[PDB]
Symmetry: C4
Subunit: 25 residues, 4 copies
């Protein structure tokens, strides 16, 4: 388990990646 702030940051980072890929495609 991780600090909730670290979980939140990981979620935001993954979604940032996903949105960038979808934008480029």
């Amino acid at each position: 388990s991780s600090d909730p702030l670290v979980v939140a940051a990981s979620i935001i980072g993954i979604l940032h990646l996903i949105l960038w890929i979808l934008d480029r495609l």
Copy 2:
């Protein structure tokens, strides 16, 4: 909970995101 260095990195990453968005807007 997380290593303090990982918490710090998550904070910096989130703030980096926020600043980028504000700059673009």
Copy 3:
């Protein structure tokens, strides 16, 4: 130890870095 979602995000981030470097080289 960390939340599995945080481990996954860290792996994805490292691989993202690696792929970017290989692309540029």
Copy 4:
């Protein structure tokens, strides 16, 4: 505390940031 892989990723991310800033300055 965090998984060692997550600590490593956080270190790499911070250093990536630092190098980018120094390059731009």
